[PDB]
Amino acid sequence: GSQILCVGLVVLDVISLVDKYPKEDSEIRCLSQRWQRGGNASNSCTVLSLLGAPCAFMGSMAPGHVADFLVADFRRRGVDVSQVAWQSKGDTPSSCCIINNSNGNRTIVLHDTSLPDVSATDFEKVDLTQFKWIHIEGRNASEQVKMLQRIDAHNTRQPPEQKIRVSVEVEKPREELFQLFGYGDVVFVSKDVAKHLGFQSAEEALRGLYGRVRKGAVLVCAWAEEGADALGPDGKLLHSDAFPPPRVVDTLGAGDTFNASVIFSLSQGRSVQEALRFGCQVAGKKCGLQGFDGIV
Amino acid sequence: GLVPRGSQILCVGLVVLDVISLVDKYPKEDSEIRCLSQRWQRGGNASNSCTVLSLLGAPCAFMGSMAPGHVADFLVADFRRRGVDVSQVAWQSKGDTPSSCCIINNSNGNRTIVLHDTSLPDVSATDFEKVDLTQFKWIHIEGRNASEQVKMLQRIDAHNTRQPPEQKIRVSVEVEKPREELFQLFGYGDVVFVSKDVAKHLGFQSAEEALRGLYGRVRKGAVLVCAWAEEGADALGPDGKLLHSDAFPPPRVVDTLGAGDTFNASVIFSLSQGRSVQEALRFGCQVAGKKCGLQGFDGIV
Ligand SMILES: N#Cc1c(C(F)(F)F)cc(N2CCN(CCO)CC2)nc1N1CCC[C@H](CO)C1
Ligand SMILES: N#Cc1c(C(F)(F)F)cc(N2CCN(CCO)CC2)nc1N1CCC[C@H](CO)C1
Known part of the structure; x- marks a missing residue:
């Protein structure tokens, strides 16, 4: 075991970078625009790569000029695409991402x-x-639950010295x-899941949802x-x-940066207190930059 | 390839x-939503007039600024899908190929737009x-960078000066x-x-008031056209x-987006085909009318 695997979307x-968030029925010219490889698990792979951790992406991709861009980005980053489930039917998903340059707030209009x-x-x-390590970004639950059981079964037939650490994102x-x-x-x-279940704080959520987790697991909630x-x-x-x-200019992928940084510090054998801290550390550096370049 | 002499209609402007994303409700800042539908279209006045001129059966070229990249590529493949000659494109070393994001609310029908940089x-x-x-x-210039386009227009005037009346490039301008x-x-x-919008801003309540009031601004022998x-x-x-x-x-109105561009292209076409100004006005109104009850430019002819 030498790599981290993220299982999710690409x-x-x-992206359109605006000075202020547009009002409804308004026509307002953007500051700048760019194309960025997204998808939660895909973003975590960018981060993991930058931290110096060899990693692999697993997800569905439809061949075309968009996937050609995506694949070129993954490679320039050293992400192992070898596990991509190439589809014949369907188009590659795209999002219109509006980043408010004044507060770093990101609004995503995804096309599934x-x-x-x-x-x-x-x-x-x-x-x-x-x-x-294997990280799964929560999409098709029933099907991913089967994937989890397959890792658990592998672990039982393996020494503690060679067990695969697993992380989930809800x-x-x-x-x-x-x-x-x-x-x-x-x-x-x-925070959005936690707020929907009736929690007003990261600590409230944690105490309220720890019953749900697997025995011996760490439930993490950023806020x-x-x-x-x-x-x-x-x-x-x-x-x-x-x-x-001091100036928050881009939060698109901050969570994906938090997740990856937590996974990396744990994968490096550091404490949960240290990993939590490194996650906030690296995620915070990202919010001051456009995209992911220059986080370390 | 070998384009025959005096065969093409050129349109200079934006691509x-x-x-375009159609949504249930307008997204509130910092939220992640899923759109009902999502379209990637090739927009711009000179760009849309080019599509229409192709469908009309005319050899046509587009001249506009584009930056090598992925956006330029999708845009070049749509021009080609529509038989537009992209040989005169002014490829830029710096800048972003224009791209706009449109958010259409399903309920109220309001269009929110984040214009290209x-x-x-x-x-x-x-x-x-x-x-x-x-x-x-024929060369058609969409009004943008006026000072520069004036010199372009002067070059055609210069060119025409040494050509016989039948080898003269006809010219049209869009304000x-x-x-x-x-x-x-x-x-x-x-x-x-x-x-109509330019006319209205100058304080004209009709196409009659606009034409009569603005004809003094045109050169000798020119035709001033206003749709309403x-x-x-x-x-x-x-x-x-x-x-x-x-x-x-x-019978029903489906899509008025690019209806002005359809009008412009059809008037240009009819005039370039030697038809009367009355015939051109009629034709432009007919083609532009058929486009309004159609999604895109698919069956306009
Ligand atoms: N780091 C970080 C971070 C920051 C901060 F600038 F504070 F750094 C701001 C932020 N924002 C979302 C809420 N906006 C509301 C405006 O009214 C403000 C921008 N989201 C952050 N994330 C989201 C992923 C996880 C990460 C965990 O620390 C927390
Ligand atoms: N036929 C026709 C026609 C109709 C209608 F179907 F209602 F009759 C509606 C309509 N518009 C209303 C909505 N406007 C909003 C966007 O700016 C665009 C213009 N324009 C039309 N014409 C016909 C002459 C030429 C003119 C060129 O602009 C296009």
């Missing part, structure tokens, strides 16, 4: 393209010996996804400018203050 | 990649100086945006198109006889 992020998701079938064809407030809570050594729950908090088996709550930049 | 440089008179004009029979800079373009070309949507279009020439065509509306 989306073309068509019928492109079939990576299945337990696609995952079954994967050589689990090259991976140190970003979208969807009931299907609450079953993934659930599985994995580390569980990232978003924008309020940093992030983690809850382990020991019952002790852990907290990290955020590392805000 | 933009319009990304001002980063890419427009076509210059030095860019235009390098063009061997002999393949063109569609209410910008003072553009009002100098009125004194150029054989055909001048003025928009549902009220059809007018044309006024050196004779002083105000001509009019009533609109030919479709």
Whole structure:
């Protein structure tokens, strides 16, 4: 096991950088525009790569000129595309991403393209010996749950010296996804999921959702400018203050940067208190830059 | 390839990649939403007039600024899908190929637009100086960078001076945006198109008031054209006889986006085919009418 595997989406992020958020029925010229390789798991691969950690992306891609761009970006970053479930039917998904340059706020208008998701079938064809860690971005829950059981089964037939650490992300407030809570050594729950379930703080959410997690797991919840908090088996709550930049110019992928940084510090054998802190650290550096270049 | 001498209609102006997303409700800042539908279109006045001229059966070229990249590529493949000659494109070293994001609310029907950056440089008179004009029979300039386009227009005037009356490149100019800079373009070309919106800004309540009031701004022997949507279009020439065509509306109105560009291209085509100004006005109103009850330009002819 020498690589980190992120299992999720890869989306073309068509970015427009605005000085102020547009008002409805308004016509307002943008400051600048760019194309960016997106998708939560795809973004985490950019981050992991920049931290110096060898990694691989797993997700569905439809061949064309868009995927040609995406593949070229992944490669320039050293992301192992070898595990991509190439589809015949469907188009590559794209998002219109408006980044408010004044506060760094990002608004995403995603276009889902019928492109079939990576299945337990696609995952079954994967050589689990090259991976140190496996991160799954919560999309097709029932199917991903089968993929989780396949990693768990591999682990049971392996010494503790060679076990695959697993991490899950529950970003979208969807009931299907609450079953993934659930599985994995580390569980990232978003502020939006937490708020939808009735929680007003990262600590409230953590105490309220720790019953849901797998025995021995760490449930992590970041909370924008309020940093992030983690809850382990020991019952002790852990907290990290955020590392805000003086000028917050781009939050698109900040969470994906947080996730990756937490995964990396844990993969490096550092404490949960240290990992939480490094996640907030690297995520904060990103919010002061456009894109991902210059985070380290 | 070998373009035959005096065969092409050139259109000089904007090409933009319009990304259109139809949504249930308008997205609130910092949220992640999913659109109902999403389209990638090739926009721009000179760009749309080129599509229409191809469908009309005319050899046509586009001259506009583009930066090598992925946006330029999608835009070049749409031009080619529509038989437009992209050989005269002014490829830029710096700047972003124009791309706009449109958000259409399903309920109210309101259009929210995040216009392309001002980063890419427009076509210059030095860019235009390098063009061997002999393949063109008509050149249409969309009003943008007026000072520069004036020199372009002067070069065609210079070119024409040494040509017999039948080897003379006919010229048309479009003043569609209410910008003072553009009002100098009125004194150029054989055909001048003025928009309802430009006319309204100058304080004219009809196409009759616009033509009569603005004809003094045009050169000797020029035709000043003004369309007024549902009220059809007018044309006024050196004779002083105000001509009019009533609109030919479709049974149901589907898409008015590019209807002005369809009108412009059809008037240009009909005139370039040797037809009367009355015939051109009629034809432009007919073609533009059929487009309004159609999505895109697919079945306009
Ligand atoms: N780091 C960071 C971070 C920052 C900060 F500038 F504070 F750095 C701002 C922010 N914003 C979202 C809410 N906006 C509301 C405006 O009214 C402000 C911008 N989101 C952050 N993220 C989101 C991923 C996880 C990461 C965990 O620390 C927290
Ligand atoms: N036929 C026709 C016609 C109709 C209608 F179907 F209602 F009759 C509506 C309409 N518009 C209304 C909405 N405007 C909003 C966007 O600016 C665009 C113009 N314009 C039309 N014409 C016909 C003459 C030429 C003119 C060129 O602009 C295009």
